[PDB]
Design an enzyme around this catalytic site. Structure first.
Site, PDB file in Angstrom:
ATOM      1  N   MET A 114      -2.743  10.861  -3.848  1.00 16.24           N
ATOM      2  CA  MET A 114      -2.558   9.548  -3.625  1.00 16.24           C
ATOM      3  C   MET A 114      -2.533   8.546  -4.823  1.00 16.24           C
ATOM      4  SD  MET A 114      -2.297   9.025  -0.288  1.00 16.24           S
ATOM      5  CE  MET A 114      -2.832   7.271  -0.003  1.00 16.24           C
ATOM      6  N   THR A 150      -2.961   4.873  -5.701  1.00  9.24           N
ATOM      7  CA  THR A 150      -2.445   3.709  -5.165  1.00  9.24           C
ATOM      8  C   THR A 150      -1.959   2.790  -6.219  1.00  9.24           C
ATOM      9  OG1 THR A 150      -3.587   3.584  -3.003  1.00  9.24           O
ATOM     10  CG2 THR A 150      -3.132   1.600  -4.068  1.00  9.24           C
ATOM     11  N   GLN A 151      -0.620   2.354  -6.352  1.00  8.18           N
ATOM     12  CA  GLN A 151       0.010   1.894  -7.386  1.00  8.18           C
ATOM     13  C   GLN A 151       0.789   0.649  -6.990  1.00  8.18           C
ATOM     14  OE1 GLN A 151       2.123   3.486 -10.509  1.00  8.18           O
ATOM     15  NE2 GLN A 151       0.526   5.304 -10.999  1.00  8.18           N
ATOM     16  N   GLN A 179       0.772  -1.160   0.081  1.00  5.05           N
ATOM     17  CA  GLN A 179      -0.025  -0.018  -0.083  1.00  5.05           C
ATOM     18  C   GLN A 179       1.029   1.062   0.072  1.00  5.05           C
ATOM     19  OE1 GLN A 179      -3.294   2.183   2.018  1.00  5.05           O
ATOM     20  NE2 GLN A 179      -2.500   2.646  -0.129  1.00  5.05           N
TER      21      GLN A 179
END
Ligand SMILES: [Mg+2]
Ligand SMILES: [Mg+2]
Lengths: 212, 4, 244, 240, 250, 235, 222, 233, 231
Positions: free
Chosen positions: H107, H1-2, G1
């Site tokens: 994000m 988010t990767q 994450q």
């Protein structure tokens, strides 16, 4: 934190400690936990330092606008309800506040409202708020009378914060004292627990649990 | 955020 | 820009009238006359059709009288299409009230909301007003039997008897003459038809140029029934009062 | 959205749409407000080219906004419903947040603000209505009477009238109302109100409405006979 | 850019007429004659396929359209306006009825929806009224056979028989003489064909006349078998040949 | 008709110019700046004797250190005042200080040209904005519906303005005491007013650093009126 | 994450005298057990005699400093070149921080300069904008090592007057700039000894009514 | 988010007396699979800047496109585009740093660590780092990934502080960089033998060397290592 | 005449009358002058007052440390446009760490003004601007008109009777263009240029407004006793 405010014969007493903690780290011993909103209005702070400070000085601005628009000082009920309606909008977002809005108006008399970040709003004569509230309650409740002299009331409020400052690890620093009357609030000084504890122990003969 |  | 082609439907004249409302009312004054008369034991709605052709399917037809709920109906004078827009709105509004309160909508409350819609078209949005006047006939347990009218201004008022559309001047004079408070429904039925008979621009009043409805307590005990008359039923009531 | 600037300035510095809204008020039935020592009375003419009216259900001309404040008006009737609804909503909202009912001045200022907003917003025309707003502030016994108009200006009046022939009845009140000695009682004040209306009205039959407002949410509408008595009693003092 | 015409283009004149609706009706007056006749066991709708050039293939231009398997429409006035109304009418039969109740709308209600669309073009901002009058013939289980006329204003009326456009006044008179409540569908087709000759100038055959019926269910036109409660469309367009068969016994 | 945002061939905005005409029809308002304070006085102009004149509010507090007088379509000023008050209180919240008078005035003036086809027309009211701040001391500003504002030592607006301005031109000097300035506003008002000036149809106010913005009661103003007649009679 | 925060270490320290104030910080920048730079300044002259450091997550620190510097620029543009007082800066920074209450800047912020009576002032902030004026504050990684030393040496805490029976406190008094720089230098060498994220270099910005001066000192590089 | 898929390992760099050197291998890994071998991870911008990128290659290619579009945009209505108003290394860096921090703040990061190396128009050396978090820093030596752990200690032996830069020639500095690349090939399991190297000199300008190889490797001692403790043969 | 109702209408000779009427408000504006050497650039503006009790309307606005402008015409329109410039200069710094080229400032203003000359409901800006600055290619002076036309010049002037100064500067060119490394001499020349546009009035201490920017001088504004040196 430990904060209290109680109504009595001679108006309202407001007393607070001055400690801020981040976990067990003592971040400050000199926080001003009472905000002077107007000459007849006080707010107490407990919970998130930023949350309390920010929204209670914001509250002062809203009270100022009321009196510009309405040519009249805001009621304690209305001032407290601005704050409580504000935090209720943020319910669930994680604001952390336990506050008391304390003041006198002619239409209300001396009035205290407890307002917290779950959106609870209560009118009442006695409240203690913060991690040390129970300690303050223990002393305060067992010596409280409606008829306390202004002199005794001031001391009891001061002594109740001292009690909590001593036992509660997350309360301390110094006691700040206020008296609120029909003529507005009067400041009754900053009292370092450093010297106040020993002074009270000696003069009162209490705190025998402690190595003298 | 520190608390009181 | 497009300002060039804007009629400005929602402005005042120098006299303080709303042009479009006035002109809409002028339009309505050429519409088939509709009459409402309120009795102690019910209400009558009677209306004249805009001049028939013999080939019009008259029994499966509706131009003047519409059901809003089980306790409320309206009579229309003006543009039918405009009226249907408002009628479906009113029907939905009735159901929202019932759904919310588990009680049938009080007549005035329905009438007010429809009139409030009309009012809006005269104050904002730059659209033309609805070219419609209604007579509302209904019952509720607060005021009992009620008659109202609304017009393109969105102004509404209550009546013992009223007409809308063509020849309301003559019609109102005639109702004023013969109406009396203690009247029964069956007397009001007669008054309504006799009034149309005299104000009509046609040669003679026949069943096929009429719509007719009653709202009585004439079902069974303390409850109310709407009767929208079939053509044959009008033909009979036209004989029964000796107009044919 | 429909955007057109309908209320705009003319070369002489007038806003014709506001001024024409005033003309619509002028055509409206007369309304008068008179405040006594301890009450406020609202009188309203009802134009008598209408019989077969049903008075039980026909919208009365004085409206309660809250239980301590009333509003009457002259002008477009449909327009007035919009202002009354907004005013009623605000009255409840004020109680909810301030924990106190509105002052008469506050409620007047609100209605006035709404009217003004409609004089400089695109796509809307001004309200063809002027209002008389009257009542008593909470826990106060000093009577209040305010007037608003399409432009948005509002002010306080010892007594005032609006609508058709209002200049005739303003004329009357200006010579008959003593600032020093306001109608010391209900009976007295109702009378002065009816007298001023009789200058303009016709018969005092089903032609005059009166609503009396006393302190602490004490509002009552007089019915025909109670008014009729006042009419009868003034003409019998008239032959002199 | 974008539509800044948010105000009505149809407004009341001081006499109370709505100019654009009147003018739209005038465009309908100009239009080619179309008609409908209601029999006891069917409805017929008919019109002239008045071709623009003889190089045009006028079978590709359908003036009579299926809306539902039991409802058909014809018009007089402006063709393009009619075309988009049929598109909208077909869709609204599904979106606001079939997708809700699992069955096709009854005639009056579909008519009601078309009328709504046409009324909105009379009041909404930045549009003109539709320049057409429709005749909608249809069948449904609880109302039987019906025929409706829809005008630019959004008004509609049920008819035993009527005509619209060019020679409507004459054609309506013709229909008053011939119509009775005992007409069997074949008789109504015959009367429709007679009425239409009065108003047609040039050629009068099955290639210049468009004519459809709402009659019996057509299982052979369904496309499938095995659901015995599904019996097929009551709407049927008569072929070029079918019309000519009825013109020799004219 | 023609766009609300249209230029005249002289290069002026029709709507702004026309609003300036509406302001000329307004009741008179006068302000005088001294080193001891700024006075603001206005003509109440009750349209009928029945109307209770104390309810006429044409002088208005913005913050403790800023006051406002108006002339023209006075209902248009409500939102300007509201904006001004919010701007002042917000500034104090963001910066823990008093907002400058010029900054306040500039904030109000930013509203002015936000009209078109935002609001539908310019404001039909001019404002005299008077206050004190630590940097530039006592100040008087004339805020027009054009969005322009000018600082003045003294200024009159409304119907009696061209007469009163010429008078202020003669009477103003850099050493006026506050009391001299109060009298002068009263004097010039009595000159240009239709009806006879008294404590009920005119109103006075000032802002001083020490006590901030105060509106004078009728008892106090009546005495300055009496003091003014005795000064004129006596030479 | 994905974790949008990091920790760049270092530590900062502000002390205020009678007519001056200092804002010091080490010049080491780290992530985990690696050194990114031995000289990457994190104390800044922001104009109007205000110095500022925002220590913790450097990316947030830089963003905040940038925003405040910009805030000073517009304060001039909008309020006729008026000087931004330290109390007004502090309040403005509270709103910058609290504006991101629900996605905070992970920094401990300190500003230093002179109040409106010409006295030295230090203000410190928590990550979401609680603030307070003090004589004294250490922030960042070694804050817990240095702060109690400062309580003792700047505010004379737990120190009594010899032979007064622990009854008379050591009396409070302002320190000279020479004394303050001594406490700063000792604070940082001590912190360097015992904290792995502190070292390399020390940069001190001193603020008086004549402007902002800098001093630099080498610190242990291990 | 990767999560990064195709990745590039270390980028290493340093300042010397007249300019800056920067290097990076030509590998695009896919987890433990050494999937692609002709990948250029140094992107020159003008003739005064090289941008070396590690991390996700799809995001690197996105950044290439941004830089190439930036050059285009700078030329627009700019008659001094190849002179006083040419893109500086400091402009290119700040632009990238701005983007990196915005993307982390949304994000949705660009999963990279970036070193911008070049020479400013006044002749000053520019060397600055920025990564997926928007963290930025400058040092006489900079490296990403394993480079930070293994190259920096070697390169800092040459330039340990500011004052060591004037004393460092381009031959010395290239030696250190090339040696550091060998070490990384010994010790980084996601490095390749092939790499590119670029020098940006304030006099000679940009020299971009492709298809370099790690050479002079020590492997001989491997033969003497038998077993893991007690085994002899 | 029939074609001046709005900006979205061409006249039959291809003119835009609303834009031309906007240009007219500039002509009613108080005179202001721009001129530059190779090391500095100077603005001089004659400030106008309402009467003798009023302030003298500011005509010069700082945009950045290296850029600023003078205005003639509608002042609120200068406030809008100068504020846009402040933002654009600002954006260049925060994002690219780059001081905005005066030429780009010119192009950005042109494009902002132009949008208001092609769309219904808007209106052209009613102000002319003279922009000076010192950037990576030296001193610059620009002239902005609300038609959207921006022009780089050694010197110019705008407002009422600006033709006097614009003629003077046209002859003086060879002199003032080479006043390098001498701030006060460039200003003197600017003050003389503006004097060619005076009628029935001359430059007082609370009437004159000067600004300078250049090689080692941040854009700064001089008013009041600070300009007495130059009268
Ligand atoms: Mg404790
Ligand atoms: Mg260390």
């Amino acid at each position: 934190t430990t904060t209290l405010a109680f109504r009595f014969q001679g108006g309202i007493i407001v007393a607070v400690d001055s400690r801020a903690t981040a976990g067990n780290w003592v971040a400050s011993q000199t926080v001003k936990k009472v905000i002077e909103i107007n000459p007849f209005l006080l707010g107490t702070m407990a919970g998130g330092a930023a949350d309390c400070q920010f929204w209670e000085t914001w509250l002062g601005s809203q009270c100022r606008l009321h009196e510009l628009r309405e040519k009249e000082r805001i009621s304690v009920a209305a001032a407290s309800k601005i704050l409580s309606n504000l935090v209720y909008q943020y319910k669930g977002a994680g604001l952390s506040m336990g506050t008391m809005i304390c003041g006198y108006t002619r239409k209300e008399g001396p009035t205290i409202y407890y307002v917290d970040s779950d959106g609870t709003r209560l009118k009442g004569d006695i409240f203690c708020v913060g991690s040390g509230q129970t300690f303050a309650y223990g002393v305060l409740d067992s010596n409280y009378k409606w008829d306390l002299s202004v002199e005794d009331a001031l001391y009891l409020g001061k002594r109740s914060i001292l009690a909590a400052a001593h036992r509660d690890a997350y309360s301390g620093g110094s006691v700040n004292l206020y008296h609120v009357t029909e003529d507005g609030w009067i400041y009754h000084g900053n009292h370092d627990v450093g010297e106040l504890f020993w002074k009270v122990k000696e003069e009162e003969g209490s705190f025998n649990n402690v190595i003298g | 955020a520190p608390a009181x | 820009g497009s300002r060039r082609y804007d009629s400005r439907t929602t402005i005042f004249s120098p006299e303080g009238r709303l042009y479009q409302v006035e002109y809409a009312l002028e339009s309505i004054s050429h519409a088939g006359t509709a009459i409402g008369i309120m009795a102690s034991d019910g209400i009558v709605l009677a209306a004249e059709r805009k001049v028939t052709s013999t080939l019009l399917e008259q029994d499966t037809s509706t131009e003047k009288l519409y059901k809003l709920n089980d306790k409320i109906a309206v009579a229309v004078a003006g543009l039918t299409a405009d009226a249907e827009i408002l009628i479906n709105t009113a029907r939905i509004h009735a159901q929202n009230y019932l759904k919310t309160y588990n009680e049938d909508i009080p007549v005035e409350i329905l009438v007010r909301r429809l009139s409030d819609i009309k009012q809006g078209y005269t104050q904002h949005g730059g659209l033309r007003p609805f070219g419609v006047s209604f007579i509302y006939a209904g019952y509720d347990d607060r005021y009992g039997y009620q008659l109202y009218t609304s017009n393109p201004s969105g102004n509404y008022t209550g009546w013992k008897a009223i007409s809308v559309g063509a020849n309301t001047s003559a019609a109102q004079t005639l109702l004023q003459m013969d109406y009396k408070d203690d009247m029964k429904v069956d007397d009001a039925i007669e008054l309504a038809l006799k009034t149309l008979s005299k104000t009509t621009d046609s040669s003679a009043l026949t069943y096929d140029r009429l719509e007719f409805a009653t709202i009585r307590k004439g079902a069974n005990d303390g409850e109310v029934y709407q009767k929208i008359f079939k053509p044959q039923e009008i033909k009979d009531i036209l004989v029964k009062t000796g107009i044919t | 959205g429909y955007d057109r600037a309908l209320s705009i300035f003319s070369p002489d510095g007038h806003i014709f749409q506001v001024e024409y809204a005033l003309e619509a008020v002028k055509r409206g039935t007369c309304a008068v407000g008179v405040k006594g020592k301890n009450c406020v009375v609202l009188g309203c003419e009802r134009r008598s080219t209408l019989k077969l009216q049903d008075t039980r259900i026909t919208p009365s001309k004085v409206s309660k906004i809250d239980s301590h404040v009333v509003l009457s008006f002259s002008g477009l009737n449909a327009d007035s419903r919009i202002l009354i609804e907004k005013a009623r909503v605000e009255a409840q909202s004020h109680r909810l947040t301030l924990e106190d009912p509105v002052t008469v001045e506050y409620l007047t200022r609100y209605v006035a603000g709404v009217q003004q907003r409609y004089t400089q917003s695109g796509g809307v025309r001004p309200f063809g209505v002027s209002t008389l707003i009257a009542g008593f502030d909470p826990r106060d016994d000093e009577p209040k009477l305010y007037q608003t108009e399409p432009s948005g200006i509002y002010s306080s009046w010892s007594a005032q009238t609006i609508g058709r022939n209002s200049k005739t009845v303003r004329e009357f009140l200006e010579k008959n109302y003593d600032r020093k000695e306001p109608p010391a009682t209900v009976e007295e004040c109702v009378k002065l109100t009816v007298r001023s209306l009789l200058e303009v009205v016709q018969t005092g039959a089903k032609n005059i409405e009166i609503t009396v407002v006393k302190p602490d949410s004490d509002i009552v509408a007089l019915s025909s006979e109670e008014i009729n008595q006042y009419v009868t009693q003034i003409e019998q003092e008239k032959q002199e | 850019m974008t539509d800044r015409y948010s105000f009505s283009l149809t407004t009341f004149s001081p006499s109370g007429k709505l100019g654009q609706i009147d003018y739209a009706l005038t465009a309908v007056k100009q239009g080619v004659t179309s008609l409908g006749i209601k029999a006891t066991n069917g409805v017929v709708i008919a019109t002239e396929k008045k071709s623009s050039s003889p190089l045009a293939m006028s079978e590709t231009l359908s003036k009579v359209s299926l809306l539902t398997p039991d409802i058909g429409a014809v018009y007089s006035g402006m063709g393009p306006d009619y075309r988009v109304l049929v598109d909208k009418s077909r869709k609204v039969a599904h979106t606001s009825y079939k997708r809700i109740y699992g069955e096709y709308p009854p005639t009056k209600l579909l008519v009601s929806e078309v009328a709504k669309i046409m009324q909105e073009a009379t009041q909404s901002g930045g549009v003109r009224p539709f320049g057409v009058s429709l005749l909608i013939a249809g069948h449904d289980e609880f109302n039987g056979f019906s025929l409706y006329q829809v005008d630019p204003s959004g008004s509609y009326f049920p008819w035993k028989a009527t005509a619209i456009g060019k020679g409507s006044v004459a054609a309506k008179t013709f229909l008053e003489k011939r119509w009775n409540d005992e007409l069997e569908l074949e008789d109504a087709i015959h009367i429709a064909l007679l009425t239409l000759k009065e108003s047609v100038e040039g050629e009068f055959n099955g290639d210049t006349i468009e004519l459809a019926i709402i009659g019996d269910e057509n299982p052979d036109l369904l496309g499938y078998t095995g659901i015995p409660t599904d019996k097929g469309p009551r709407f049927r367009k008569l072929t070029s040949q079918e019309i000519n068969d009825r013109l020799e016994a004219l | 008709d023609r766009g609300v945002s249209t230029f005249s061939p002289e290069g002026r905005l029709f709507q702004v110019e026309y609003s300036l005409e509406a302001i000329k029809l307004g009741s008179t308002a006068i302000g005088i700046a001294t080193k001891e304070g700024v006075v603001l006085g206005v003509e109440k102009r009750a349209t009928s004797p029945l109307l209770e004149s104390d309810s006429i509010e044409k002088i208005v507090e913005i913050d403790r250190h800023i006051g406002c007088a108006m002339s023209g379509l006075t209902a248009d000023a409500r939102s300007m005042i509201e904006h001004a008050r919010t701007a002042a209180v917000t500034h104090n919240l963001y910066y823990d200080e008093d907002i400058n008078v010029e900054s306040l005035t500039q904030s109000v003036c930013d509203l002015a040209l936000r009209f078109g086809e935002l609001m539908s027309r310019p404001f039909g009211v001019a404002l005299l904005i008077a206050g004190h701040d630590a940097d530039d001391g006592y100040q008087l500003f004339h805020a027009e519906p054009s969005g322009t504002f000018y600082r003045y030592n003294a200024k009159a607006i409304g119907s009696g303005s061209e007469g009163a301005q010429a008078e202020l031109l003669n009477e103003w000097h850099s050493s006026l005491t506050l009391k001299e300035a109060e009298l002068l506003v009263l004097k010039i008002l009595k000159q240009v007013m239709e009806e006879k000036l008294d404590e009920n149809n005119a109103q006075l106010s000032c802002i001083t650093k020490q006590d901030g913005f105060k509106i004078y009661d009728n008892e106090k103003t009546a005495e300055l009126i009496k003091e003014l007649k005795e000064k004129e009679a006596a030479e | 994450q994905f974790n949008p925060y990091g920790d760049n270490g270092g530590t900062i320290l502000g002390i205020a005298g009678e007519d001056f104030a200092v804002l010091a910080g080490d010049t080491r920048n780290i992530t985990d057990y690696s050194i990114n730079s031995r000289y990457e300044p994190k104390v800044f002259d922001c104009g109007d005699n205000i110095v500022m450091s925002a220590n913790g997550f450097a990316a947030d620190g830089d963003a905040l400093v940038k925003r405040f510097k910009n805030s000073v620029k517009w304060y001039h543009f909008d309020h006729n070149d008026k000087k931004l007082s330290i109390n007004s800066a502090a309040r403005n920074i509270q709103h910058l921080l609290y504006g991101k209450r629900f996605f905070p800047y992970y920094v401990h912020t300190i500003i230093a300069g002179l109040d409106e009576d010409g006295k030295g002032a230090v203000y410190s902030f928590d990550p979401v904008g609680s603030y307070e004026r003090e004589q004294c504050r250490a922030g960042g990684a070694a804050a817990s090592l240095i702060m109690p030393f400062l309580d003792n040496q700047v505010n004379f805490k737990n120190q009594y007057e010899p032979g007064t029976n622990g009854k008379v406190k050591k009396p409070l008094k302002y320190l000279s700039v020479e004394e303050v720089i001594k406490l700063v230098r000792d604070s940082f060498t001590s912190a360097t000894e015992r904290h792995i994220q502190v070292g390399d270099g020390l940069e001190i910005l001193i603020v008086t009514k004549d402007g902002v001066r800098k001093e630099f000192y080498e610190l242990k590089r291990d | 988010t990767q999560q990064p898929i195709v990745t590039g390992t270390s980028v290493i760099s340093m300042k010397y007396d007249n300019g800056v050197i920067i290097a990076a291998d030509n590998l695009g890994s896919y987890g433990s699979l050494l999937r692609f071998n002709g990948v250029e991870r140094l992107i020159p911008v003008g003739d005064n800047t090289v941008v070396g990128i590690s991390g996700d290659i799809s995001d690197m290619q996105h950044i290439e496109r941004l830089l190439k579009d930036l050059v285009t945009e700078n030329a627009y209505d700019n008659p001094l585009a190849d002179a006083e108003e040419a893109l500086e290394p400091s402009y290119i860096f700040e632009y990238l740093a701005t983007v990196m921090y915005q993307r982390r703040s949304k994000m949705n990061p660009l999963w990279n660590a970036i070193i911008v190396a070049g020479v400013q128009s006044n002749g000053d050396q520019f060397l600055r780092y920025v990564n997926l978090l928007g963290v930025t820093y400058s040092s006489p030596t900079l490296a990403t990934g394993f480079g930070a752990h293994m190259a920096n200690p070697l390169l800092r032996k040459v330039v340990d502080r500011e004052s060591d830069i004037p004393k460092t020639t381009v031959q010395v500095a290239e030696e250190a960089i090339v040696n550091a690349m060998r070490v990384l090939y010994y010790r980084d399991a996601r490095s390749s033998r092939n790499f590119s190297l670029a020098i940006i000199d304030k006099n000679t300008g940009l020299t971009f060397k492709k298809n370099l190889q790690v050479e002079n490797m020590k492997w001989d001692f491997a033969k003497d290592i038998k077993g893991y403790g007690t085994q002899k043969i | 005449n029939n074609y001046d109702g709005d900006t979205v209408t061409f006249s039959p000779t291809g003119r835009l009358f609303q834009v031309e009427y906007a240009l007219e408000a500039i002509k009613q504006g108080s005179v202001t002058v721009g001129l530059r050497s190779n090391t500095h650039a100077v603005l001089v503006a004659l400030k106008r007052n309402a009467d003798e009790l009023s302030s003298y309307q500011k005509k010069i606005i700082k945009c950045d440390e290296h850029m600023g402008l003078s205005l003639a015409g509608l002042a609120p329109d200068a406030r809008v446009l100068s504020n846009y410039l402040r933002q654009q200069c600002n954006y260049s710094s925060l994002v690219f760490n780059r001081k905005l080229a005066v030429e780009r400032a010119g192009h950005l203003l042109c494009d902002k003004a132009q949008k208001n000359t092609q769309s219904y409901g808007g209106r052209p800006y009613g102000v002319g601007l003279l922009i000076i600055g010192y950037d990576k290619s030296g001193a610059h002076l620009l002239e902005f008109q609300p038609s959207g036309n921006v022009t780089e010049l050694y010197g110019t002037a705008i407002g009422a009777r600006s033709q006097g100064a614009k003629t003077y500067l046209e002859r003086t060119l060879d002199t003032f263009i080479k006043i390098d490394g001498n701030p006060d001499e460039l200003i003197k020349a600017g003050v003389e240029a503006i004097s060619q546009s005076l009628r029935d009035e001359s430059l007082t201490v609370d009437n004159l407004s000067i600004a300078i920017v250049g090689k080692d001088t941040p854009f700064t504004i001089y008013d009041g006793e600070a300009v007495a040196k130059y009268i």
